[PDB]
Every structure is written in C-alpha cells, then in structure tokens.
C-alpha cells in the first residue's frame, strides 16, 4: 500500500475466485461455496499472496465440458470453432467477497459459512501481471501442477 | 523389532510399480483488469458519506 | 543429513575466525567485539548499502525499536524465517510470482543475543550478512524449526529504528 | 442419563468317563437386560434389549497346585449360542437401535494352558516351571447386518479395568496400555492372545506365596471376523511378581515393553505397567 | 511385517513357509521319510500312527530372526519374530490317530521407501509397503492298512489377505493431495494333502522308512479389488475409488519323496525331495485397465520350485546317569530353487545349513527343541538383493498321559 | 559473564511510566520524554526498580566504593539535566567473576 | 423417568379434544387439491407426528414464488406451550404487551437449506425474545416440512412434537404450537 496514509484504504481480506460463467449467477441464486467452481482464500500478508493451492476440481470441470461437447459432436467437430465461440469456457473472476458464519456448535468448534456477498465498504489492493502479459512473458503468471505419471 | 527393510527391493518389482514418478510442471496464466457490471448488492447496511483518495 | 550437528557448527564458526586471521583481505570478513560477552567476536559480511535511507545517521540502542527486512538460514543455506525468500528483498519487483516483502519491526531487547548486539552497531540502510554462534543464537534445545546447537546466518537490511512503535510503524 | 443392566444364570455340570475321568461338562443357561436412554459409549443408544443364551463346555484340568502349578495343564472348549431371530423362526445412525430388540450371535473359544518343570521337581520342591498361554476367539453372526452390539470383545492392559462395564468381555494383553487395541468404533469380533512365561517362586506357604516371572506374550484383535489372522499379532516381552495374601485374593506387578505399533501409531508402544488384583 | 522383510515377497503369494516342527527344522526340513513318533508332524498324515497308546501331543513354537540385507553397495540388517505352528495330536485306535492344528502357508512383509528431488526444485517421496498373508488349519487323519504300510490325508481350511500398496508423498508442500493404490487380495477356500509310509525291518535292529506326500492342482475363491486412494492425510480419510475385479488364483501340484535310516533307536539319518509345478498354473485376471492387467501379470507370475535336504539325529547311550546322554543332536542342509520369477528369468537361489537340540524334561516326556538355521539367499541377476539371514527356534512337545483309565 | 540490562522507574504520576533509553555503546542512560516541570518535588525521594543484571552487585563512587541500596529510596534532584555543568549519576557493575568491569552515567 | 416421557402423545391428544379440531391423513390432504377447511378445523397429519393446518397458502395472484433451496426467510410467530398452556415466544404485536417496543420490532429470519436428503435451517438473525430466552441458531425442523406446501407470504399452523423441536423442546421432551403469521422470502 502506498503513502503510509493514517485513515487509508485496507487491502480486501477475503477474495473469491470463480468461473466466469457464474459471475453474477452466484451472488443472484445466493449459493455458497461450491468447490468445484469457485473458492475461497484469505491474504497471507506475511508474504503478500493470494494463494489457492489446490484447484484440482475447476480443472476436470473445463476439462469434462470440453470433452462432452467434443463426444456430443463427434465427426463434425471442430476445435477452433468451439474456441473461438463460447470464449469464456477456461476464463475465471477475482471478487471481494464479505463472508459471515454461524456462532453455534462452539465448544466443538466448527464456524460453518452461511453467506457470501459482495464487498462493500472501500478497500483495494494491486496485483502483479497485466494485460501486457498477453504479449510480453515477463508480465505473465505461472500456475503449478504437480501429478502422477505412471510411465504408461 | 525392526519394520523398514530400507529400499532394498526396488529393481525387482514389476515395471508397473517402480516406472511411477511424480513431476512438477508450470503453465502461464494471463490476468487483466476488467468493469464490474451491474453487481446484485442486496445488503442490508446502508452507507453513507463520502472521502477523498 | 543432520549428523553430528553441533561439532560441525561450530567448526563452521572456527573456520570464520581463523579465515579472518589467515587469508588475504581478511577473506571478505569484518567482526566486531561482544558486550555480553568481552573477548568474544561476531563475524560479518559487508554488502550493497541502500540508496532510500531515511537519512538517520546513529545506531540504535538497547530498548528501542527497530524496522528490517531480514531472512534466516541455517549453514546448509536452508530457509527458517524471514520477510524474503529470494537472494534480495523484494520492492516493485519485476517477477509476478513473488510479491514484494513486508518490513517487520523489532525490539532489541526482544530478540537473539547475536541480533542485540549487531544491530546496536549499523546505521540505516546497512545490509550486512552475519554469522552467529550457537552460544548466542536460541541455542541449546533450540525453538520450532531449529535442530538444536545451530549456528544461524542472518541478511539484514536496516530501514529505520525509534524510541516508539507508533513514531515508526 | 444413565445405563441399566442386570440378568442373571443357571447352570450345571457333570464329570465324563469317555476321553478318561478328569473329562468335565458344563452346561448353562442365562437372561440379561440392558437399559439406556441418550447413552453414548456403545453403538445403541435408546432402548432396552434382550438375550438368551445356551452355553456347553468341555473342559480337562490335570494340574496339581491351584496356586503355582507345577505339572498337568487345563484345556477348555466353549461355545455359546442364541437363538437364530433371523431366520425362519423369527423372519422379519439409520436404524441400529431397531432390529436388537432381541440380539443374536454364536460365540466360540478354545483356551489352553500347560505347565512343566524345568528341574525334576519332588526333590527341593520350590522347583522352577515354564508356563504356556493359546487363547482364541471368535463372535459370529447369523446375519451380515445385524451383528450384535454386545458381547464383544475388548483387548488391552490389565483386563480388569473392563470390569467396570458387564456388557464386554475384556482380555488382557501385556505391555499395551489398557483396551488399546479395541477403540470405540472398533470393537473386538475376534481376538487371539498366545505366550510363553518362566516362573520361579520366592516362598509357597499356608499363609502366603510368592512367585517371580520373565515372560513373552503375543496378541491382537480384529473388528471383522472375516480378516481373522492369527500369524500377524502385536509382539510383548517383561518381567514380573505376584503376591498371594492370607484374606485377600493375588496382587501383582508387571513391567512389559510393547514392540509393534497399533494403528500405524507407536503412541501405545513402550514401556508399560499392569497391576493386576483379584486373580486373572 | 511379522514373518519377513525379504522385499522378495513383493512377487506371488510372498515366501513359503515351511510348517517343519522342532525336529524337522533342525534336521534340514526331512519331514517325508520320518516316524519319530516323540514329536508331531504334520507335513506327511501317514505318520500319525507312531504315537504311543496313552499319549496326548500339543506341539507349539516361536522364532527370532536377523536378517542382513545387501545389494548395489548397500548394506542394512532387520530383526523380526514369528510364531511358526502349533497342533495337537492323539489315538483313536490301536491302528488310527487323528490331528488338527494351525499352520501358516506363506507370508510378505516389506516396506521399501525413496526421496528424491527433481531439477526443478520439487522435492518427493515413494513408499512401497505390504502386509498379510495366507493360512492354513487343518483336522487330518492316518491309519494302518497293513502291518507295514500306513495312509493319511489331510483336509484343511486355507485362508488369507495379502495387501500392497504404493505411495506418492510431497514432503514440505503446503496442502496438496497424495495418491495411493492398494491391491488387495482376499482368499477362502479348501486344502487336501495326501501321504503314505512304509517301513522295512533291515538287519533285526535297523529299520528304513519311505515316504510319499501329494496335492492336486486347484482353483481358489477369492476377492481381488483394485482400490485407489486420493487425498488421505494425517487428519482425513480421503476418497477411494474401488474396483472389483474377476481374478483366478490357483494352487499346483506338488510331489515329494524321502527316506529315513534308523539304528538301534540311536541314529536316524535321512534325505527328501520335492517339487511343486508353478509353471503349470493359469494365474489371470480380466479388465479394460492395462495399467491393473499388466500388474497382475507381473506381480502374480512362478516358476517350479525345488527343494532338496538332507539330516540326521543322534542320541547316545540314553541308559546311562549323565544328562548329556539323554540329549538329541540334530545336524542338517538344504537347496531350494524358490518360485520368483522376476523379468523373464529366475530370480534367486538359496541354501542353508541347520543344527539343534532335543533337551528332555526329566521325569517326564516333553521335549524341548531349541535349533538354528543359518540361509543364504543369492540374487542370480546383478539388479537383485542378497540375504544372509539367522535364527533361533525354540518349540515345546508337551505331552501326558491322557486317556487312561481303571 | 554478562551486563545485560532493564533499567526503570517507578509512577511519578499515577499510572504513568516513563520510559529509558540504553546506549551500551557510549554507557549511557537517559529518558527521551522529559519529566514534567512539576516533578522536581516528586523525584526527591524516589524509588528505582527492575535493574536487573546478570550479577546484582553494583556500586557509586563515594574515599570508597559504596554498595547500591537497591531497595530502597533516593533522592535524584541532584542528576537532572546532566548534559552541561555535567554531574551524571555515574555507578558501576561488576561482573558474575568480578572480572569485567563497567560504569554507566545516567 | 427416561421412555415415561415420551407421553407427549397423551398431552397432545389432549390439546386436540380440547378443541374443535379434525385430522386428516396426508393421502386426502393432497387429493381434495389442496386446503385444510377453516370452518371444519382441519389439520393434516404430516410426517415424523406434525400436525399442521394452512390458513392461506400465499401469493395467490402470482402463484409462482414458492420456497426453495439457498433462500433466507423471515418468519413471525408467536409459540404455545403444550403441557402448561402459556405463551412462551413470540415476535409480533399484541395489544396486552402493545408498549414492548423491543420484543416484536424485528423478526426471525433463516436460511434454508434443501439438498437431496436432511433439510435444514439456520438462523441467520434471531429476534430479541428468542435470542434471549433460548439462545440458540438451529430453525425448529417442524417448521421446514411446512414449506413444500406453501408460497410466500402463507400464514400457517403447526403442532410440533419433541423430536422435531427446538434446542429446548429435544431435552425436556415438551411439544409446541406455532401461530405462524408469516413467511416471508427475505427482501434487502
């Protein structure tokens, strides 16, 4: 953050990342974490990171829309097309997102969410890569995967 | 008692269970900023005020 | 890996102070006399001083505070604690995969006998890398994430010491 | 909140003349209740639940010192069965504290010791004798699904720490804390318990007796009768003393080192102690 | 991990083993061609009818063992415990006995680990574990037909579980999931084993005896499953994904034969052979997974194991006061060929050498049977480990004078 | 065998504490925040606490050397503003052994 | 007493036959389309020993908006005790406490939730009265069998045995009757 203001604004504490197909469906149809389509992670301000570790799921689901649509279509199917058409099929959102939790079942403490809504009051934070990226690599992220290869 | 045999054994089993490996590999991602849009707010808060930045 | 621990830490120690006695241009090495403990020596490295000093020339003192940006690893160069990971601090860094490094404030009451005394001695914007026995480390038994009878060896960058937390946070 | 149990037994014995003459049968029969409402530590619990039970066993017993034994040995056969609800006879948490109304199993057990001595015995008669321990167990069920929540086995320590609940049968095992292979949700439907000892006694007289010992045991439990294994089993070894008193019944200390782990955990494992009172 | 750590028993059913009691195991396992009718055994049923009139047998055992383990260099050396048989064993008739015990058929036990970091920085590490094994408890019987010959068979309950697993770990990672596949093979089936005795009068104080065992090929129900797990931890269970699969699992036939010389109730010496057709046997399984098919085909494949031992006992001037006169002293050897088959060749080839003790309990007829056995175990292909391995024996024949009567 | 240090002082107002600065560098001691105008009759007999060391034994020039009575009240009208006309309250610590030797001015 | 109390049936049999109130089976409640008759007292015996009556089922220009997984409704009521006939809860106005200005300003409001098996319902705003007295966030499961039956803005009645009861009702084994004035989809 910038200029060591007094009375400045925070950077958001909690952020929720979520396929752009639901976008605004999410907060609409009033769901709650789904864990195959969107996640949830605090800032670690120890070392200034939004961290997901593991989005395993969202993965095998862009991957299985793809392939069904591929089986569905069969001999007429045509991979540029199907890229070029729906073009927010692998794209996810960043959203400030104000999370709330019950207070019962405390002594065995458990704190389940019961809503998630936009981020209201100010705040703001800014990230590293941009839109330069998209031309230039050093402005560019990089997501780790690690699996097992079976040597097949 | 002892319970390890260490790793004495590998290069006798059959090639289906020592070819396994793990790996590590990176893939770039791209980010940009974009308009929010017409946000469903519906809270029950009400703000008021204003401030400079 | 971790065998006969503290013998070979502290001939780590010994090979610093004999290098400094032996080798020419002291083998890059500078010390500086313990007030814990008179006779005894810390060793240090000097290194590319800042160029954004807050312009406050002294040194702190016993019972103030003090900001830095400081990274810990063990002789084998291993990670334990810091506020950077890389071989620099990080601010406005270039690299999207790492973020730029928070500044963390101290007490020099509150911390190692190694770092109390060598911080009474730089002067802001000093980046010295320094090599601290076990005597004068947590020692002993060691805390969460030390083996025990470890020399420790700290980079540290000093960005700004006060009297209070509220003047310099 | 409370639990309730009470029942009581009838049985009848008589000595044989087919094997030889120290041949004896027993036969018993035996009605418990077992009352709860909002109880926790067993699988039921709100109800009330029956059994009847028919039990033989044969048994041989050739010893000739009840006290410390020194030649012979002692054998036993046992099997006890409950009616078979399930069946024809009766036909027809989810729905557990349903269906034990009545409970229904067939336990079985087979349990054998055998004394020598080592050193001719008769002449100086403080002798010293090698001990030798071969118990099994198994709880079977009529029907796959409605295994009985009772009478389960219960293995670990100095087995009479279960004796504070009537419902199980605890089973000592040496050098293992107390009921540690047998955790709540894995409770015992087969068990094994083998091993050795050497004992030497200190004084045999009318009053008092007193003996020392090594020994060597070996145990283990199983939740699923089906994975009975009696060739895989948690290792033991110690030493130990035993005091009987002229108007109290054995006391004893026993020191064991447990050498396998349970559960993936060596938590339980170690130097242990058993003081053990009543008799065994 | 109670009977073995040989990583061997990776492959197959594990090792076999020998269900040879006190006297056998230190007289090299010559258990065909003997009639001492002092001590049980179970791996011929013509011999039960050696027991004396009023006796009842119980028969038990124990062993520890060290077993040093070396390949590529390496050298290490790991301790275990078993419990190796027990059986009972008494009269019906003046022409019959009958037996029932507990035996074990064959047991796996390894754990062989790995670390590992790759150029990239990641940092991993492999486990390959395995546990369980296969049982045997048998009721047998064996009678005289003529004064000479006598016939047995035994009918046995033949059961077991042999799991193996492998692992996938990321030492140091924050959060992530660790993949683990157990393969599980689940047995309960039937055993039969028949034999047959017949002893010579040679020189009117001699005696010589022949024994032949056999066991027909079979075919065992069983419950093979593929279950992979993703996600386990030191705080959760993870999630499996089973698989049920139509294995066949078999036994051979096996055929052995033996001798035993005998003196003046002195001297006994003795030499067996055997063979057992793996190489015969349609082990096999059938799924749409390569990956699981080319396991099974790998991991369950034989080759005919042999065996070949020879032994002796002798017993000194067991009349006259001095207590090493009433002691038995056993010696003996063997050579075995064992059934791995790893790639397309034969894996190892082992030899041992045997000796023990018979002390008697004074005043009485029980016997006590301490023994060692000292084996080597070669790798015949330079990939492969090598084993010396050690161990005692201890083993006690109660026995007492049981069905008498007034 | 150490001089390891936690000077302090006790309320002058009630509930406030001031705070000391300790240069081992230049052995010296001194508060930053100075005491009000109204503590010249406060401080004339005022206790000191928490100067723990590694050895307690500690000393002011007196001819002698005279034993700090720790524990009990001082009078400190005397060491205010001792940077001109300079008269310090100068005292010294010794060492676990006695063998290191030490003075700071406060 | 442990199964002695599990006579709650008898109390509530009594609360029936002490008023004029008819009973009728779930397989005529949904036959007859669908209404409890007001002018005969009816009540339908629903599932797990609720006894529940409509007395308007809703939105009955739109039809449409009925209840549904995810969504937060806001209820007002005021509870009945069975066993000792007294008014124990409530949220709305009456004139007999009309200057009690803090027990019925604000009302209950819950989230619903509706996957493939176990309904249930969480407080998410407790009103004044109920937050004081039984402190406690988990919806009364009576009420949650009530909703498939029902638009919004129905006002229902309900007789809640112990094992669907509240945090107080499952441990002193006490049925309630509910005067449900409204649920209501929560708006803002």
């Known amino acids: ?152 | ?53 | ?169 | ?280 | 991990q109670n009977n073995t750590n040989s990583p061997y028993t990776r492959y197959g059913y594990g090792d076999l083993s020998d269900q040879s009691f006190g006297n056998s195991k230190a007289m090299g396992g010559i258990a065909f061609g003997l009639r001492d009718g002092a001590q049980i055994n179970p791996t011929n049923p013509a011999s039960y009818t050696a027991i004396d009139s009023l006796t009842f047998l119980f028969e038990g055992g124990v062993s520890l063992q060290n077993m040093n383990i070396s390949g590529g260099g390496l050298k290490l050396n790991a301790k275990n415990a078993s419990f190796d048989y027990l059986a009972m064993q008494f009269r019906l008739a003046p022409w019959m006995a009958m037996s029932v015990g507990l035996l074990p058929y064959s047991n796996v036990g390894y754990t062989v680990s790995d670390s590992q970091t790759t150029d990239n920085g990641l940092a991993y590490s492999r486990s390959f574990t395995g546990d369980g094994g296969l049982h045997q408890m048998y009721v047998g019987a064996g009678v005289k037909v003529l004064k000479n010959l006598s016939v047995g068979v035994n009918a046995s309950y033949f059961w077991g579980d042999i799991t193996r697993t492998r692992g996938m770990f990321y030492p140091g990672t924050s959060s992530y999931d660790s993949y683990q596949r157990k393969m599980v093979t689940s047995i309960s089936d039937y055993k039969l084993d028949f034999g047959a005795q017949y002893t010579q009068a040679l020189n009117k104080k001699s005696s010589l005896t022949i024994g032949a065992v056999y066991s027909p090929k079979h075919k065992l129900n069983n419950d093979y499953t593929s279950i992979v797990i993703m996600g386990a931890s030191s705080s959760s269970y993870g999630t499996e994904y089973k698989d049920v699969l139509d294995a066949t699992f078999e036994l051979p036939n096996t055929f052995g034969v033996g001798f035993t010389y005998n003196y003046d109730k002195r001297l006994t010496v003795g030499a067996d052979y055997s063979l057992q057709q793996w190489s015969k046997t349609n082990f096999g399984v059938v799924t749409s997974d390569e990956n699981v098919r080319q396991d099974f085909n790998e991991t369950f494949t034989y080759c005919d194991r042999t065996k070949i031992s020879v032994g002796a006992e002798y017993i000194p001037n067991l009349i006259g006061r001095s207590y090493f006169a009433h002691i038995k002293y056993r010696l003996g050897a063997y050579y075995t060929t064992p059934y791995y088959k790893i790639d397309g060749k034969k894996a190892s080839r082992e030899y041992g050498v045997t000796a023990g003790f018979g002390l008697p309990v004074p005043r009485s007829r029980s016997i006590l049977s301490i023994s060692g056995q000292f084996v080597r175990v070669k790798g015949l292909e330079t990939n492969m480990v090598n084993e010396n391995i050690f161990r005692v024996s201890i083993g006690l024949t109660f026995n007492e004078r049981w069905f008498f009567k007034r | ?106 | ?188």
């Open chain 6, 1 to 106: 065998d150490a001089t390891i240090r936690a000077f302090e002082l006790d309320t002058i107002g009630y509930g406030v504490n001031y705070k000391f600065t300790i240069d081992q560098v230049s052995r010296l001691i001194y508060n930053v925040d100075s005491l009000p105008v109204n503590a010249d009759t406060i401080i004339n007999s005022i206790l000191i606490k928490t100067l723990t060391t590694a050895s307690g034994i500690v000393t002011m020039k007196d001819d002698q050397d005279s034993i700090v009575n720790i524990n009990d009240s001082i009078d400190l009208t005397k060491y205010v503003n001792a940077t001109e006309k300079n008269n310090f309250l100068v005292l010294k610590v010794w060492a676990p052994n006695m063998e290191v030797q030490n003075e700071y001015k406060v």
């Open chain 4, 1 to 280: 909140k409370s639990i309730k149990m009470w029942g009581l037994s009838l049985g009848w014995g008589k000595r044989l003349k087919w094997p030889d003459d120290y041949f004896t049968l027993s036969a018993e029969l035996a009605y418990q209740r077992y009352n709860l409402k909002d109880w926790q530590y067993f699988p039921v619990t709100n109800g009330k639940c029956n059994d009847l039970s028919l039990s033989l066993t044969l048994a041989r017993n050739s010893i000739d010192n009840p006290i410390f034994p020194r030649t012979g040995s002692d054998f036993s056969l046992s099997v006890q069965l409950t009616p078979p609800y399930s069946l024809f006879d009766g036909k027809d948490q989810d729905n557990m504290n349903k269906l034990h109304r009545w409970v229904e199993y067939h336990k079985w057990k087979f349990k054998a010791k055998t004394y020598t001595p080592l050193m001719d015995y008769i002449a100086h008669p403080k002798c010293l004798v090698l001990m030798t321990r071969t118990e099994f167990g198994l709880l079977g069920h009529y029907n796959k699904y409605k295994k009985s929540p009772f009478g389960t086995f219960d293995v670990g320590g100095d087995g009479m720490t279960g004796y504070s609940s009537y419902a199980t049968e605890s089973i000592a095992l040496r050098g293992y804390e107390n009921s540690s292979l047998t955790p709540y949700g894995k409770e015992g439907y087969a068990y094994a318990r083998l091993g050795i000892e050497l004992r030497y006694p200190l004084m045999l007289e009318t009053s008092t007796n007193i003996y020392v010992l090594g020994f060597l045991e070996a145990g283990n439990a199983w939740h699923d009768i089906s994975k009975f294994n009696p060739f895989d089993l948690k290792r033991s070894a110690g030493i130990g003393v035993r005091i009987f008193l002229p108007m109290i019944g054995m006391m004893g200390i026993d020191w064991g080192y447990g050498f396998d782990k349970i559960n993936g955990s060596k938590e339980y494992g170690g130097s242990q102690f058993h003081f053990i009172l009543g008799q065994e």
């Open chain 1, 1 to 152: 953050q910038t200029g060591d203001k007094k009375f400045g604004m925070a950077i958001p504490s909690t952020v929720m990342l979520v396929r752009k197909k639901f976008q605004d469906s999410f907060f609409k149809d009033n769901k709650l974490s789904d864990g195959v389509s969107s996640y949830l992670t605090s800032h670690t301000s120890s070392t200034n990171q939004y961290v997901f570790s593991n989005i395993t799921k969202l993965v095998n689901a862009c991957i299985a829309e793809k392939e069904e649509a591929k089986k569905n279509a069969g001999s007429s199917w045509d991979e540029t097309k199907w890229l070029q058409e729906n073009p927010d099929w692998n794209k996810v959102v960043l959203i400030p997102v104000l999370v709330t939790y019950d207070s019962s079942n405390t002594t065995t403490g458990q704190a389940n969410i019961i809503r998630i809504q936009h981020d209201l009051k100010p705040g703001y934070v800014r990230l590293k890569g941009g839109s330069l990226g998209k031309t230039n690599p050093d402005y560019k992220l990089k997501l780790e995967v690690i699996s097992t290869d079976f040597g097949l």
């Open chain 2, 1 to 53: 008692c002892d319970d390890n045999t260490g790793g004495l054994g590998l290069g006798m089993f059959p090639g289906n269970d020592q070819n396994i490996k793990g790996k590590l590999s990176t893939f770039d991602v791209t980010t940009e900023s974009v308009k929010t849009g017409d946000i469903y707010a519906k809270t029950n808060i009400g703000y008021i005020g204003k401030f400079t930045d």
């Open chain 7, 1 to 188: 007493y442990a199964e002695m109390l599990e006579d709650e049936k008898n109390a509530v049999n009594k609360f029936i036959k002490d008023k004029g109130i008819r009973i009728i089976s779930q397989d005529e409640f949904e036959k007859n389309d669908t209404v409890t008759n007001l002018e005969r007292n009816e009540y339908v015996a629903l599932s797990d020993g609720v006894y529940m009556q409509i007395v308007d089922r809703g939105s009955a220009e739109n039809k449409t908006d009925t209840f549904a997984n995810n969504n937060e409704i806001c209820v007002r009521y005021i509870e009945e005790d069975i066993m000792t006939r007294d008014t124990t809860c409530f949220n709305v106005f009456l004139e007999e406490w009309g200057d009690a200005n803090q027990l019925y300003t604000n009302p209950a409001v819950f989230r619903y939730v509706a996957e493939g098996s176990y309904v249930y319902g969480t407080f998410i705003q407790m009103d004044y009265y109920w937050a004081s007295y039984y402190q406690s966030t988990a919806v009364p499961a009576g009420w949650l069998l009530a909703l498939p039956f029902v638009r919004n803005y129905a006002h229902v009645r309900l007789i809640v045995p112990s094992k669907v009861g509240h945090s107080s009702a499952q441990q002193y084994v006490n049925p309630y009757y509910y005067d449900i004035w409204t649920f209501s989809k929560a708006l803002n």
């Open chain 3, 1 to 169: 890996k971790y065998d006969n621990w503290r013998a070979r830490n502290e001939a780590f120690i010994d090979s610093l102070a004999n290098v400094y006695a032996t080798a020419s241009g002291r083998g890059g090495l500078e010390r500086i006399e313990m007030l814990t403990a008179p006779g005894n020596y810390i060793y240090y490295k000097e290194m590319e001083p800042m160029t954004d000093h807050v312009v406050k020339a002294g040194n702190p003192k016993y019972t103030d505070y003090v900001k830095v940006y400081y990274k810990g690893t063990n002789i084998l160069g291993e990670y334990f604690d810091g506020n950077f990971k890389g071989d620099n601090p990080v601010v406005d860094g270039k690299d999207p995969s790492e973020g730029d490094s928070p500044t963390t404030i101290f007490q020099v009451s509150g911390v190692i006998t190694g770092w109390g005394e060598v911080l009474q001695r730089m002067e802001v914007g000093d980046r010295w890398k320094v090599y601290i026995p076990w005597d004068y480390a947590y020692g002993s038994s060691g805390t969460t994430g030390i083996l025990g009878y470890s020399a420790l060896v700290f980079d540290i960058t000093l960005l700004d010491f006060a009297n209070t937390e509220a003047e310099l946070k």
